Ligand binder design. Structure first.
Ligand SMILES: Nc1ncnc2c1ncn2[C@@H]1O[C@H](COP(=O)(O)OP(=O)(O)OP(=O)(O)O)[C@@H](O)[C@H]1O
Ligand SMILES: [Ca+2]
Lengths: 357, 40
């Protein structure tokens, strides 16, 4: 019997089957619920006037265990089209996930869905597994939160884990903020989803910011026009790289927190001095926020500056790194060596939700 | 006996060579057909 793997992201839930190289279903982690029953995903956002939506996952952490229960319900029965009673499921948790959540996670899976066996795996760790490693630091930047997760021989180093409350939402929000004064009113929830599309197609990161800012102020070689549902076509200049620049400069949106290139450096410097070289030489990038073109070489430049001048700094960033965390799960579950690491239901009834640690 | 089984699963992922385009092609096919469910 083939297994199921379901990555529960803050913004989007990615789910499919163990063995596949790509997830099968991708939909927003959103539950809408009128005061009359309750809709999930793109259904829910289609009716913002009738419904009131709630993201059950905030910053990688599950906060709504009833709305989450119906997200998992929607995943199995609607999107995947499969009875969870006959297939083991691998779920993903955020780094530093409370043991309480994990015990709820298993409890729901076995009692509500009657899953035959299960396992939870840290999101960032699966990203590392996808690139065929067990050692290296992972930059997992997604929709809600950005993490720096040092991993050594499978386990993460929690004390060394850096986190940045800045992601796809903040970027899409800052893109609105900068496009608004060039002349262009983008302020409502409808106009946001096209600004998000602006972000995902025409935004890159600069290698040298100030240099690129000077190039734009002189010519329009970096010009880009868009097209709002309604037939207008636009010009966006320096906005293309000033948007993802906030990832390296949180100062842009009034954050005194450090950029993702410094949080990477800091995260490694707190690890054991044994490992630091292996971390420098295995900097894997994961998540959809890392999908900006040129972000590897910008990270390459910024880390070589901070790190010891002689140090080997390799930055892995696959083209599939948007679903990197899921593919790691798809791999791990299909590995024939992993099936004894499954947590069977025959045990959960014998030990309880506490079993999953 | 856990650490034993837990290393066996790590040598498996260590001895793994990722095929980035059988992935990126399977990603771009699945993405293509999601994007098609937009009839109206
Ligand atoms: N080419 C792209 N360029 C920039 N951003 C992109 C791109 N593709 C997708 N995204 C953005 O990355 C986010 C979705 O990626 P991801 O699935 O990793 O988020 P998530 O896992 O749901 O949230 P989190 O990791 O915080 O729990 C979105 O904010 C999306 O707008
Ligand atoms: Ca994620």
């Amino acid at each position: 019997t083939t297994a199921l793997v379901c990555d529960n992201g803050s913004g989007l839930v990615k789910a499919g089957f163990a063995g596949d190289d790509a997830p099968r279903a991708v939909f927003p982690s959103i539950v809408g619920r009128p005061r009359h029953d309750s809709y999930v995903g793109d259904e829910a956002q289609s009716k913002r006037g009738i419904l009131t939506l709630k993201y059950p996952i905030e910053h990688g952490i599950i906060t709504n265990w009833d709305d989450m229960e119906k997200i998992w319900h929607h995943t199995f029965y609607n999107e995947l089209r499969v009875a969870p009673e006959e297939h083991p499921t691998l779920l993903t948790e955020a780094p530093l996930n409370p043991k309480a959540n994990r015990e709820k996670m298993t409890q729901i899976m076995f009692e509500t869905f009657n899953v035959p066996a299960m396992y939870v795996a840290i999101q960032a760790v699966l990203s590392l597994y996808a690139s065929g490693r067990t050692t290296g630091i992972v930059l997992d930047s997604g929709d809600g939160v950005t993490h720096n997760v040092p991993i050594y021989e499978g386990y993460a180093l929690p004390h060394a884990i850096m986190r940045l409350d800045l992601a796809g939402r903040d970027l899409t929000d800052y893109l609105m903020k900068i496009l608004t004064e060039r002349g262009y009113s983008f302020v409502t929830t409808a106009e946001r989803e096209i600004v998000r599309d602006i972000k995902e197609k025409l935004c890159y990161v600069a290698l040298d910011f100030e240099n690129e800012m000077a190039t734009a102020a002189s010519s329009s070689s970096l010009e880009k026009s868009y097209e709002l549902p309604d037939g207008q076509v636009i010009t966006i200049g320096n906005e293309r790289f000033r948007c993802p620049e906030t990832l390296f400069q949180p100062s842009f949106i009034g954050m005194e927190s450090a950029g993702i290139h410094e949080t990477t450096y800091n995260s490694i410097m707190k690890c054991d001095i044994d490992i630091r070289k292996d971390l420098y030489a295995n900097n894997v990038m994961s998540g959809g926020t890392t999908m900006y073109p040129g972000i590897a070489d910008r990270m390459q430049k910024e880390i070589t500056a901070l790190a010891p001048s002689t140090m080997k700094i390799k930055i892995i960033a696959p083209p599939e790194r948007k679903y990197s965390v899921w593919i790691g799960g798809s791999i791990l579950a299909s590995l024939s060596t992993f099936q004894q690491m499954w947590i069977t239901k025959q045990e959960y009834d014998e030990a309880g939700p506490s079993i999953v640690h | 006996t856990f650490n034993q089984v837990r290393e066996q699963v790590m040598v498996a992922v260590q001895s793994l060579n990722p095929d980035h385009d059988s992935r990126v092609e399977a990603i771009d096919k699945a993405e293509k057909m999601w994007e098609m469910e937009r009839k109206l």
